[PDB]
């Protein structure tokens, strides 16, 4: 018995990450084994760590946490440095509009766990961690139980299936800080401290948990490892376009008829996501904007871009928040400002002060109480959150809002007039 979870709609054209998680329920180990679960692990333990790294490299799998760093190269970087090494699954998923990782956690834990074990073995880590946000309590208990199940079927513990490889997966809980999704702050939290990002360099692959080589990979990244081993890198790359191959999860919300998670190839266009898959818009209103989480803002001019990692592609995490023609852009921007205000950890002064002032001033604008100086101030702080910032939050806390200013001037101008 687990806490109540809303039944998010899930749909797939590729039937990989959502083969089971398209069904809104906990798939336990037996049902997992039935479809050939844990056989990729078995195959992996009969391979060298170097070869697994090679396959993940050649698959062109890239991180799904937002920074988009090649996974195999990441792993290769860590194994250049003496052990012991640690593997961390990043399940903090707290950016507005993003709910894709949780459906893997809640419906198909063993897809995740199988990935962690292969990955850990690939980098020689005997200690792995899932860091899951505190507001995902059902995910927490589902993971713990699925870990117990894996242990009893002999997939975890010492000398896993006679291989000589030992592994324990510990499940840690967050407690309300979006910044703890930043990998260095994640590691700080795991070491029992506040979620304060560390200055880079050094980089975790060199110096992370207890100063030791540490690979942090997103849940959805890890969800792909089973498949790369199972089908081989060459069959894997045949999925979608040669350039950006592989399955990808798109959490679609806002003013669409069918909000939910969609598993699609990355040659899909943003327009297709909205109109082909998510049923179009509510009331068939015209799309005004798409928020790529709390990162970017695309106009209705920019729908025909691919959902990939090309220069001109959507990028980000595939998070699609749809706003239609009656949605007030300033109102929406304020909500973004508020998020950043609540999530700056405050160690960098321009970020600390910017996030605060951007929200406070924008709220005055919104309420029609801004002075002429408040307006110029707002403009100014929005351009000056980033300086001296030691992590990406401060780099992007102004980004989306700046884009709305540049793409919807007429609607802002009305607030100024």
């Amino acid at each position: 018995s687990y806490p109540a979870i809303p039944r998010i709609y899930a749909e797939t054209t590729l039937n990989m990450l959502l083969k089971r998680a398209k069904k809104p329920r906990v798939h336990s180990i037996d049902e997992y084994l039935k479809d050939g679960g844990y056989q990729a692990l078995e195959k992996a333990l009969n391979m060298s760590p170097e070869e697994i790294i090679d396959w993940v490299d050649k698959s062109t799998l890239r991180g799904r946490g937002g920074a988009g760093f090649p996974t195999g190269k990441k792993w290769k970087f860590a194994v250049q440095n003496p052990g012991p090494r640690y593997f961390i699954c990043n399940a903090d998923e707290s950016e507005p509009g993003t709910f894709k990782d949780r459906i893997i956690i809640e419906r198909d834990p063993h897809l995740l766990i199988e990935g962690i074990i292969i990955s850990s073995y690939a980098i020689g880590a005997n200690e792995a961690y899932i860091y899951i946000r505190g507001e995902y309590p059902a995910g927490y208990y589902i993971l713990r139980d699925a870990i117990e199940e894996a242990k009893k079927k002999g997939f975890l513990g010492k000398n896993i299936l006679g291989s000589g490889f030992d592994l324990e997966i510990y499940v840690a809980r967050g407690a309300g800080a979006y910044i703890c999704g930043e990998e260095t702050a994640l590691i700080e939290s795991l070491e029992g401290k506040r979620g304060h990002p560390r200055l880079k360099p050094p980089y975790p692959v060199q110096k992370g948990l207890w100063g030791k080589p540490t690979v942090v990979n997103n849940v959805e990244t890890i969800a792909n490892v089973r498949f790369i081993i199972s089908m081989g890198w060459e069959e894997y790359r045949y999925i979608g376009p040669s350039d950006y191959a592989g399955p990808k999860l798109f959490p679609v919300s806002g003013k669409v008829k069918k909000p939910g998670v969609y598993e699609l190839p990355m040659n899909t266009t943003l327009r297709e996501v909205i109109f082909k898959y998510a049923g179009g818009t509510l009331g068939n209103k015209k799309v005004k904007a798409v928020f790529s989480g709390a990162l970017d803002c695309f106009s209705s001019e920019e729908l025909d871009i691919p959902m990939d990692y090309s220069p001109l592609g959507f990028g980000g995490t595939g998070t699609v928040i749809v706003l239609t023609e009656e949605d007030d852009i300033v109102e929406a921007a304020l909500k973004i400002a508020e998020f950043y205000e609540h999530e700056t950890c405050g160690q960098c002064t321009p970020c600390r002060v910017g996030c605060y002032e951007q929200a406070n001033l924008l709220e005055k604008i919104y309420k029609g109480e801004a002075t002429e100086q408040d307006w110029e101030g707002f403009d100014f702080v929005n351009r000056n959150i980033q300086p001296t910032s030691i992590c990406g939050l401060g780099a992007v806390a102004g980004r989306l809002i700046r884009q709305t200013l540049e793409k919807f001037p007429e609607e802002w101008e009305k607030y100024r007039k």
Binding site: P6, D101, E135, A138, I321
Partner: protein
């Protein structure tokens, strides 16, 4: 004179023993305490500190930082209402209006009986089911007041 009752002390020790190093169990311990009491007593921190082999101010620093923890208001049931972008578009204010109609409180407030506290939170990662709320660990999409009233009748 503040001492954790045995059942709680036991559960805390489980967490402290779970990770390789004791200090890694601080957030699990703090979730436990808040679950047990309905808030984090200030008196709990010193003894927690001793079990973790950490100084008190470290522990206090941690409580101040992490938004899920509350040292001020006891509540049986925390109603976490999402106030972020997608829930806002889809009707956070209708959810709150309906909560006020039923419980008689606004965000920040605790019922007189101390049974329900409304906690405004950032995106809960269920945006397709906006507007989203939790009641302790349970999570739900808000549909309407009558639907909400029935859900809340489940918590006694």
């Amino acid at each position: 004179e503040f001492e954790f009752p045995e059942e709680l002390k036991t559960k805390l020790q489980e967490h402290i023993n779970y990770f390789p190093k004791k200090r890694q169990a601080i957030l699990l311990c703090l979730h436990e305490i808040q679950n047990y009491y309905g808030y984090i007593p200030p008196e709990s921190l010193k003894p927690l500190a001793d079990m973790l082999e950490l100084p008190l101010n470290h522990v206090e620093g941690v409580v101040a930082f992490y938004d899920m923890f509350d040292r001020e208001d006891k509540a049986k049931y925390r109603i976490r209402v999402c106030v972020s972008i997608v829930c806002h578009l889809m009707g956070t204010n209708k959810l709150l209006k309906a909560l006020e109609n039923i419980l008689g409180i606004k965000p920040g407030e605790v019922t007189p009986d101390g049974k329900f506290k409304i906690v405004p939170v950032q995106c809960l990662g269920a945006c397709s089911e906006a507007p989203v709320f939790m009641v302790n660990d349970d999570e739900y999409k808000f549909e309407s007041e009558v639907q909400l009233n029935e859900i809340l009748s489940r918590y006694t």
